[PDB]
């Protein structure tokens, strides 16, 4: 029972060897490249031999018995909500590239996966969602509007509200004429032939969308997989009360500035906007 | 690991009269006339789950 300090005088059982981070500056010659993650420190602490010293001297422990004490550390980080390190800044998502007229009467539609990038800093779950969509817009303002695709058929859009609370089982349209303004839970709205990649993104968990079997690599979720979750179109309100036969059946096609909701046909009530929240507890659970 | 986070919304009852305007459609408050089938008055101190 004696811990040798080489000099001074050995102390008996129950001793303390501190390993602080305030000693890195003094060791100027070892941590001259690494920042607080894998730095070297002097667990000597004599108090008169200047900053760094006693590199050759070792804190002895007897050969007859082995020691083994506690380790009550004190960690403290400052890692942002989004950064290149944790892989939360980038997230892929196949969006429309162009859409012109070629072949005479044909209409070719091209789609290509594009890796997006978010800025370092901004926190809060709502603010991150708005930024994920802000990246979808900046992509359109550099490739989209210059080639062909309109502001209407913009693929990929993250939301939070339930697009089926005002839906009536008879008419088939959202009677309020406006989707209920009240968020419930984040998801991923998609248009024909477009999805979102999350194999190299932890932003999937943030939205609250995990796989029942996370051990399988590949979090691909295209539009073809969201069968049975069509967003019910709105009801023509300015026509329903005006006429008062009744309009009812007639859904809202255009609006202010004129932007078509992309209806599947002239007869049906649903649109080409597949929702994730609606495909969960509203579709077929089998 | 599910807890209870005690809050405090003095805006209650008064936010109800404003939320009907923040949202575009009175879904919950479909009967703003009837004094029984109306929207339940928002109670003070809202408790919400927090995975700790």
């Amino acid at each position: 029972n004696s811990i040798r300090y080489s000099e001074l005088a050995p102390l008996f059982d129950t001793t303390r060897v501190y390993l602080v981070d305030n000693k890195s500056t003094d060791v100027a010659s070892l941590n001259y490249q690494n920042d607080h993650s894998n730095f070297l420190t002097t667990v000597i602490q004599n108090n008169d031999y200047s900053p760094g010293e006693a590199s050759t001297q070792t804190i002895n422990l007897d050969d007859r018995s082995h020691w083994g004490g506690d380790l009550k550390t004190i960690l403290h980080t400052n890692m942002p909500n989004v950064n290149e390190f944790m892989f939360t800044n980038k997230f892929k998502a196949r969006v429309m590239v162009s859409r012109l007229p070629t072949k005479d009467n044909q209409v070719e539609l091209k789609y290509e996966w594009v890796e997006f990038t978010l800025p370092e800093g901004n926190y809060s779950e709502t603010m991150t969602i708005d930024l994920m969509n802000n990246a979808i817009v900046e992509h359109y303002l550099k490739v989209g509007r210059q080639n062909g695709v309109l502001e209407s058929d913009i693929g990929v859009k993250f939301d939070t509200r339930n697009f089926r609370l005002g839906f009536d089982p008879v008419t088939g349209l959202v009677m309020p004429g406006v989707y209920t303004n009240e968020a419930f839970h984040p998801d991923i709205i998609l248009l024909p032939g477009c999805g979102v990649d999350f194999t190299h993104s932890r932003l999937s968990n943030l939205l609250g969308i995990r796989k029942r079997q996370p051990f399988q690599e590949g979090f691909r979720i295209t539009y073809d997989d969201l069968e049975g979750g069509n967003i019910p179109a709105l009801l023509d309100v300015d026509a329903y009360q005006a006429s008062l036969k009744k309009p009812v059946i007639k859904p809202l096609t255009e609006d202010s500035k004129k932007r078509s909701y992309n209806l599947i046909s002239n007869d049906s009530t649903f649109t080409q906007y597949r929702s994730w929240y609606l495909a969960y507890n509203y579709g077929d659970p089998q | 690991p599910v807890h209870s986070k005690s809050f405090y919304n003095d805006q209650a009852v008064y936010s109800q009269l404003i939320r009907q305007f923040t949202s575009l459609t009175h879904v919950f408050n479909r009967f703003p006339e009837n004094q029984i089938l109306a929207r339940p008055p928002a109670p003070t101190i809202t408790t919400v789950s927090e995975n700790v």
Partner: peptide
């Protein structure tokens, strides 16, 4: 006017 069908949702005004 039809006659029997109240959306049951104060759409007005």
């Amino acid at each position: 006017s039809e006659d029997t069908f109240n959306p049951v949702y104060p759409y007005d005004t």
